[PDB]
Amino acid sequence: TTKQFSKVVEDLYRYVNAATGKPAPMISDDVYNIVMENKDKLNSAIVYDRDFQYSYFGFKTLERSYLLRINGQVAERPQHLIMRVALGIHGRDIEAALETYNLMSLKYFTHASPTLFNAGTPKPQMSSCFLVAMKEDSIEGIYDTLKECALISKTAGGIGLHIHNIRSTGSYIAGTNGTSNGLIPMIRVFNNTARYVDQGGNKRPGAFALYLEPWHADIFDFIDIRKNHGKEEIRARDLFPALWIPDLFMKRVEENGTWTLFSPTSAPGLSDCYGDEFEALYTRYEKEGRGKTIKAQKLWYSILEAQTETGTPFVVYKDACNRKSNQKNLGVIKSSNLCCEIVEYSAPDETAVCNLASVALPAFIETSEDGKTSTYNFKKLHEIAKVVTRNLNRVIDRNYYPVEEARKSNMRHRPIALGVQGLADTFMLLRLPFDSEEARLLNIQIFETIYHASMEASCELAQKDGPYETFQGSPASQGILQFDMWDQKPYGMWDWDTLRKDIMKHGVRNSLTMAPMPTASTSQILGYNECFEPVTSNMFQVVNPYLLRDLVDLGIWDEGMKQYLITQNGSIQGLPNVPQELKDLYKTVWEISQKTIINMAADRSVYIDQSHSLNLFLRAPTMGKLTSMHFYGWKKGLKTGMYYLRTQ
Amino acid sequence: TTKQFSKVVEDLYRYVNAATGKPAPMISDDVYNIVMENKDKLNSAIVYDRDFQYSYFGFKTLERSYLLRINGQVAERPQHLIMRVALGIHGRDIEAALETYNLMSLKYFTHASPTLFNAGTPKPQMSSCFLVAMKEDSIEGIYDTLKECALISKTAGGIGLHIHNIRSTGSYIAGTNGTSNGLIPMIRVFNNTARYVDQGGNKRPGAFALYLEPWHADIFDFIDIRKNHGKEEIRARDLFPALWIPDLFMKRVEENGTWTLFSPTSAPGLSDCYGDEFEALYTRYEKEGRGKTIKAQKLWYSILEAQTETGTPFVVYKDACNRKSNQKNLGVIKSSNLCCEIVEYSAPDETAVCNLASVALPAFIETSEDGKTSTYNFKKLHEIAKVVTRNLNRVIDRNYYPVEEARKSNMRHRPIALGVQGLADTFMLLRLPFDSEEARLLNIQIFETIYHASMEASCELAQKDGPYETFQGSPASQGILQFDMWDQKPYGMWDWDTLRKDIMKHGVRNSLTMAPMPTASTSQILGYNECFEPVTSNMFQVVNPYLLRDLVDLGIWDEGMKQYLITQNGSIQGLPNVPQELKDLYKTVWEISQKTIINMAADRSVYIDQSHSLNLFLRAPTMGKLTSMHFYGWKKGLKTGMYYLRTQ
Ligand SMILES: Nc1ncnc2c1ncn2[C@@H]1O[C@H](COP(=O)(O)OP(=O)(O)NP(=O)(O)O)[C@@H](O)[C@H]1O
Ligand SMILES: Nc1ncnc2c1ncn2[C@@H]1O[C@H](COP(=O)(O)OP(=O)(O)NP(=O)(O)O)[C@@H](O)[C@H]1O
Ligand SMILES: Nc1ccn([C@@H]2O[C@H](COP(=O)(O)OP(=O)(O)O)[C@@H](O)C2(F)F)c(=O)n1
Ligand SMILES: Nc1ccn([C@@H]2O[C@H](COP(=O)(O)OP(=O)(O)O)[C@@H](O)C2(F)F)c(=O)n1
């Protein structure tokens, strides 16, 4: 189709829905005027040959859901989409747009799907998720919340909703002899609304995540919300249950002690405090017989059966999240998000927003020596991270907010979330086993630099535009950075004294900056493995590109391989003519020590403002196994103990 | 249990929910202070022996759901409940309360269930239904409406909701390539909320009625909402579909012509006009090819199949309702209510309210001559109707409104709805066949007096408190009363010249006053047949009290009867030793000419401000039969062509 960018913008901007005779522009007024006023500079900036930097499936993903279409026909070329995003982000700052265009077109990084969809369009909703607070334990608060969720659902983005404050089943209701129906019937109302506000196009069906602390009396039905064999009307098939767990629960379980189930109305404040204060308030309520005591392990057993069967509920630690958040001065954080990476404050008048982008880790690998060997360019990584940090900052300002609570939240705290992809690819290119000592060090270094860089750029922005509204009084304002809250010394590749000094001096423009996300779709566009996890399989059919090369360079790649791989689930262990060095490098996530996965996750966590979507893979899932993985992650101090639990 | 009224009030007022330690009073502060300040006068006013004026099933209905309970134990005696209602209605006007107490305790009349439940209690929601308008064709308007319906559902009362303004399936949506899901998926959202806001106690499960004009493009799925064999997720099992039909549809059907289906967005204003203006606007839209043309009879056939199978959709005529409403100066009436008797104006900021009460028609029968024979006391009926009119007026002022839209509506137009019960009983006591010439005259007279009386008392109230806010400009302000709008002369038993003169002079306190309702439960308490319909059957087992007496006075009542009745569906026709005079008097509604039912309904309609719940009973339901019944009622000028369609 058409090549000239300014021309594609014209078509997209002048578009009319023929069947209705309604003008339906796919580009904002402001971005259109910016393209027209710089058509020469923008048109001759694009390198159309870079469109060949996408694999078959990569390109297909873009064509299928990303490239803007005109009457069902793809109107945009990948380069067109990238310049649109660049402009949608930087506006009149053309020099900034050109930089983002080249870096993105060269695959150094990319933005989240909502941004690739909507940046530069009339309703530019560029954020990935929203953390919504249940407004009030009332029919009015519940329906105001339902309305808010529906409006948010109109456009792109997932929702995280905490419901700790809702009255449990059988609870008393003043003004009637009836009693509360509890969480399930209310959850089912939300399930139904998620299915109705369907036509976002950009939107993914349900995509709702529910957060609940384990002491809520309706806890047992809540965790079984995704079973496909329940009592039928007690399930919520399109929503995801997530546990907001206090350390107290884990200790009682580990002690094989007791656990008490409370209706929030008969035991107020439990979600409005954490740590020691929560334990004192909980223990006290427990002694006064305000709830129903049970054996901690009884609840625990149901949790593992539910995860083993459905993969849910996710596990995120309430105390670790609150104790180690730079937003702790805002109040108590009552939830995470749909993908368990965002840890931001929310309230009835404030819905936290996810502003995402991921850095392409493999793009920093280079020979730079003599060849054969290859090194990692941390200096370049640092440089790009600062670029992305500025981008996500602009996004906060140019974003279209579906609801006022989301605007209020984002403008006040300006949280940001940089992530990664291609970690596995990186280790593979550098020929480093995922569970090796070298890979462990690289993991630490990469995250240390991205964190230093994001905070450095954020500090520069604070010098230019002032700190975010709630910066004063935050841990960062007192020189307490993320790793300090883990009581560790940074690795040291970068200078933290100077950065910390500058931060205390000038502050930072963003309250948070890190939150490695799943990148399920955006990683598919760049052709790398998802985020920070090992490859799930070494296998239209496509065998691991790196495994292929090596098997060819040994000639050993015949047909007794292509057939093996497909049969043994992309696994090459226990395979005859394959060097040990290759078996060690191309291990599958099912073949890697889940304990090593959790260590590296803990290592990089000291440099993560928020959290990260840690999926756990258990091949032979026994109860005791799954139990030690949870407690191992918990004692490791992780925030997100587990996102999805995948089995096989 | 306890006898002293003031004492029962004390217990009900001091009540504490033991399991919670929460004070939970069942009597308002104001009504409590009024009882305490007049305990002597109130206690010695009650005639406890009147509690024996209730049949077994009558009393049981009261005990089961009406008499206030304390910890699951009945605390109120029927007399206690009546004085509570009297006080709840009249407040400090003790003389008024005493009158209502005696008349109610003597069974001259009663108030609707919501009033018997809640009058005199802390949240006195005494109204029976609300007519709600879909706020806007937007996700926001839909969810604001959903919220409003949920809040209303918290307490007693049914809901009528018109959705003519919602975008049809496939309709275009600006800002996305997705298209509208249409009515069904939205209806299902409402169905789900009706099931969730369950714990009103006083409340009846779903109880939602939906109103839609037959030109809406989603009309075909809408009318099949109650089929128990549909595509499963296209049904709304707990909601009732009601058609808001324009004369144009009936004419096209009768002409075997065409009918066009429009999405309101591609054909605006259709529900915002009626009569000639609607036909001109409709015809015009039709010619401009804005919708999908079909054969009128195709839709018609589906309507009858749906009614024949489910008993729905109800049929209420849009043009007859609007053309003959005293509220026509407010704007276009877009719906009726759950029971098809209320015809009141509604809008986004105004939810019409049903304030109901029914007069016990048999209570005015008396020998007053010499015996054997008996006459009807219209003077007494008139007197009581004025009493009830004043009561429903007080209710409007002392009522608790669930939502602001309902308060705004009721305070502005002050609509009232008097009804009846025991019509069948009346004819039976007076030994008048339902389909006789005598019964026809009595029907006309009774309704003429209740209408004259309600308007007379309403006029007195206007002289005391001023006309309702929107009285000026109404048909009544121009001397146009209900029968004038049917272009008929009143029967004449009462003097209309003087009343009409006074009305034009001083106005009336209420915009509307008549709306004979089903009285399904309240009629069970007084022991009479429902509202204005013939007995459905002459048969714990209980044979018609009047049929019993007669069969005994002939001795012919043995056992070959009790056995017959139960077998022949309480029918005595084609029965050997029974005088023709008895067969004619005790005909069943299935044995009475549906055409005679519709005539008497048309006769009394000239004296009905709003409409009346006209159920239609067809024994051998063929299409052509059901068709002529609809067109016969339509040409008769009825507003409510049909409520439920019962078959057998
Ligand atoms: N009619 C109802 N049907 C279903 N759930 C209800 C109902 N009324 C209240 N609830 C539940 O009770 C809570 C809402 O009570 P809400 O309407 O705010 O209070 P209220 O009527 O003023 N009574 P209370 O909260 O005891 O003072 C929520 O957790 C609801 O799910
Ligand atoms: N995401 C959605 N999912 C399901 N139905 C939708 C969605 N968006 C809109 N609708 C339907 O479209 C109407 C609401 O559109 P609304 O949200 O008010 O308009 P909008 O987004 O501003 N688009 P438009 O009305 O064309 O200008 C209602 O009839 C909805 O049921
Ligand atoms: N097309 C998409 C893709 C993702 N998302 C949202 O981003 C979150 C996770 O994004 P991800 O998997 O890390 O990243 P991408 O699709 O942007 O690659 C989900 O919670 C989401 F709600 F699913 C979304 O709203 N729309
Ligand atoms: N216990 C009750 C009884 C009735 N109603 C409402 O009044 C309407 C009809 O009342 P009805 O049958 O004529 O009268 P009663 O129960 O008051 O005798 C329904 O639409 C209703 F929604 F069903 C109600 O809300 N609660």
Ligand SMILES: [Mg+2]
């Ligand atoms: Mg409340």
Ligand SMILES: [Mg+2]
């Ligand atoms: Mg709109």
